Design a protein around this ligand. Structure first.
Ligand SMILES: CC(C)[C@@H](NC(N)=O)C(=O)O
Ligand SMILES: CC(C)[C@@H](NC(N)=O)C(=O)O
Ligand SMILES: CC(C)[C@@H](NC(N)=O)C(=O)O
Ligand SMILES: CC(C)[C@@H](NC(N)=O)C(=O)O
Lengths: 303, 303, 303, 303
């Protein structure tokens, strides 16, 4: 019948001193809880294995590297995959990826989709990196993603995960219609990812009180206009003196929010998902083939 | 000058037999009221000179042709232009455009921008035509725009209207991120247009109660993600037995709705507009040149 | 830890010819589904055993009486109670109650709370009856609740249901702050009920497009201002030619909608409920004892 | 006359040393701008003449006293009244009222209504005082209103202001359904006031990201359920190192927001107001006399 139960595993803060073993325990706990509630897939936050390190300027490269994964899964994260396979619940995990290619230490803000058999189905590397590249004194806390990561090199793919077409986005990506549209054009039925969104923005603080609004607006508009179910898992709460936005959510292809977290701690929410619901949009008001006039969208792709 | 006062002139229903002279009287009234309240520009609905004729299945070309404009403006509509120049308030007027080229008729769902001097400074032709192509007996009312209009051939231009960079969308266009983005990439500070949106949709009636939601969601998301002020003028009310959506609105570049109509009759709303407000988005979170990666958006422009 | 999983069992239309046995099958199905997802309690709609008969004017008293329950549970509804006890999931059921007292045939729009042991814990009879008392020709469909029911005679009680303080409201009641406040003052941690809300209102059709908005606004404001979790189960869809509002929901004590249905058919939604969350409001911004000045609210209770 | 144009004059921060003369200049500017745009009444913030002093723990009564008004208006504030009479635009002004009775000081958080003739036609004193009573060291800023003000002693009156029945609320009051209902029962057509709402709350910081939501939710629900136009004027921005909420608004009796500010500085918004619109609610769904059952609301007035 093409139905399933989707879950979002919101994370509370992760301390700089908090170990990966300790984080995995928290992830295993949420995954198990989701499974008990019938979930077949659970979405975890962006960079969900450590504290959001981009908030600090590093001078020691060994220290910076400590926040990156060189294996996936490694012995420490392995338990999550084993449990996922055991309980038959896939997941989307975000983490910092360090890979050496041709003499270059490549760093990506990454996310992976694992199916209900514990097998990695696909990867995505954050294409829209927000923030800045150089330390900025006027900021109460940094957001050096442009310094610690390079734009993703995998485009915006859509993978078959347990009979569901799933596309991945990572945090800031959710605000760009292009990311949603490319995956929408690739037939995504579910577009999911996580985020680390401070409720304070140094560059434009006059938008602080609109942090939730902008986050939900992006999720709802993206889902609706592409007729795709969506889910966003944030890492929220006061993490290392920086308040992070909560309001993790699951959204229907109509843009209707069907599930929303209300705490700023580890929290699991779930919602029944009918993949055929996407047709109400993609076969009608948003029947791409019947209505789109791409001959007029060229500027969007100009370099 | 970077400050101005924008207005929206929502229309109540226009009867099948209501003359353009009578409609012009209503338009003049709203333009006059808007100017008295400081507005120097007012947005009117899509096809603001006639009843929404695409709701009927025509069998006589002469009857169909009667709903189109062969000149803009003709003697009947000219008074609106004269008053706009007198009071110093430009406008966006929607209408059905009939052009005869070498004995061949061309039909467009059109909108024009007139500056505070009463001069036409730009035209746009609806690119995204909603509805169906053939008569469908089950529908209480049809929506045969695909038959009565050709997709626009002017692309999504942005024009300078009295020191303001303005782009035009027409009804359905507002639901397509591509329309907004093209104009966003062309630097539009204001994106505006009108609409005739029935609160009932025959093919997907399960979205009827979401009519306001989808409309406002599209306007808010479009404004926010392109950092553009926006305005949507609807023709609402029970027109020829078909209930049309109201909730005409003016929206800030943050996506915040600053003005909204509450009736289903002719109604004017105004909002102070600072063209520099756009910078809060376009020079930061949505600084296009700094964050976009167009090399990965190619699929959006593929035919 | 004072936690539980609350569910809402939205109903699709119930035909005039649809039997109670057939309705009970649908209710049993949702209750079972909820239980499988970990729900300890499920809220069903107002008058959930029959079609919304108040929409018709009856001349035959025997026919009117056919829609009322004279027993609760009777042999037909008994299965629901048995299953509730089996699976350990309580519920809130709405139905038309007919009881003869002192020679008077009393009719109430009623709802009952049954605990996880299948035992009826408390009853509530609708105090705010909307609509009219006499047949009204100008209406496309009637809403004769004032004719078929008499205002409830049990006040707005709050009962202990499996260690949770629960208050009941029935449809229109949710729009009156007095109903919420009385139960709020009685310590309700969960305020729940169901509804039959046509998306069309004959008296004031200009509010039709606001049906969802007003319903959700009432649920959110009631929850927030009383620091109570809440849930509303509607019977939606096209029932006997009258479209009924969907958007069944579960709301947190902060007023945040945590679960929302998206179809207009039988649909189950669930949300984790922490009764202590009520304290975030009732012990602070809405600490009644510390902030209320009842010496100034007298007019609210004047006859 | 049943038509008018209502305005809201939102204030940006008022410094601790900013004089009343300087504040009056800002108020005159907004009143003048509002009138030029057709407004015949403008709502100003709570304590609109000084910085929000309740944020500090005072130890000197003379310093505290300096923030209160001993006369209304005194020579400094009089110019505002004169301009209101000149331009024909009344206003709602909030301020700290200090009264000396038989050698005894009485302190109130007050608001007055002045008609378009510049005459004071009504007064209200804040009944719901938020915050705490004793100094709390952990808080970055205090909120000692319970110490610097006595709960209002005028109840929730409704006054006739230039053919409009208006009621007053002050900040926190807007979150209490009782305040709105009393004025609703007294027939208010417009319920207005101002507010100083920090976007951060020390005791319950987990609701910080919901500050706008709770504010707007309270205004929308209050208007809808009492069928009253409403307006809330906030003093927003970073005032003395404390960020205050913006989103000043004008709301229709349907609960629909018709105007909203987007900056955190002095800002004027206006909306056309039809006093008869109230009837859409008060003569139908919320026809008090026809639907209310006050005999069951007694608990709300119990001391
Ligand atoms: C900094 C914030 C604007 C950005 N955060 C992120 N992790 O990508 C976001 O778009 O959520
Ligand atoms: C029919 C409706 C869906 C469509 N109306 C329109 N005039 O384009 C719209 O997009 O508003
Ligand atoms: C008719 C509608 C206004 C009313 N319906 C109801 N069943 O009580 C309601 O308040 O939901
Ligand atoms: C402190 C805040 C919660 C309160 N402020 C206020 N001035 O009354 C308010 O209710 O807006």
């Amino acid at each position: 019948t093409r139905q399933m139960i989707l879950a979002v595993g919101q994370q509370g803060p992760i301390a700089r001193a908090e170990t990966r073993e300790q984080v995995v325990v928290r992830l295993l706990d949420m995954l198990t809880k989701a499974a008990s509630r019938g979930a077949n897939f659970i979405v975890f936050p962006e960079l969900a294995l450590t504290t959001f390190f981009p908030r600090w300027h590093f001078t020691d490269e060994a220290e910076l590297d400590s926040f990156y994964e060189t294996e996936m899964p490694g012995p420490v994260v392995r338990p999550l995959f084993e449990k996922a396979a055991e309980l038959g619940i896939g997941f989307n995990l975000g983490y910092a990826e360090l890979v050496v290619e041709g003499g270059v230490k490549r760093r990506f803000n990454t996310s992976i989709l694992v199916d209900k058999s514990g097998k990695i189905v696909g990867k995505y590397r954050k294409i829209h990196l927000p923030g800045h590249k150089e330390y900025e004194a006027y900021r109460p806390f940094q957001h050096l993603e442009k310094r610690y990561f390079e734009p993703g090199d995998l485009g915006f793919p859509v993978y078959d995960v347990d009979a569901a077409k799933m596309g991945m986005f990572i945090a800031n990506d959710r605000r760009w219609p292009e990311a949603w549209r490319v995956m929408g054009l690739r037939g995504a039925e579910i577009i999911c990812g996580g985020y680390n969104t401070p409720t304070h923005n140094p560059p434009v603080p006059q938008h602080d009180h609109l942090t939730s609004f902008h986050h939900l607006l992006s999720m709802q508009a993206g889902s609706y206009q592409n007729g795709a179910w969506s889910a966003a898992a944030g890492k929220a709460g006061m993490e290392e003196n920086c308040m992070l936005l909560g309001h993790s959510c699951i959204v229907a292809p109509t843009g209707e929010i069907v599930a929303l977290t209300t705490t700023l701690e580890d929290e699991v929410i779930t919602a029944a998902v009918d993949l055929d619901r996407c047709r109400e949009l993609r076969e009608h008001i948003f029947n791409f083939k019947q209505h789109r006039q791409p001959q007029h969208y060229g500027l969007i792709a100009e370099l």
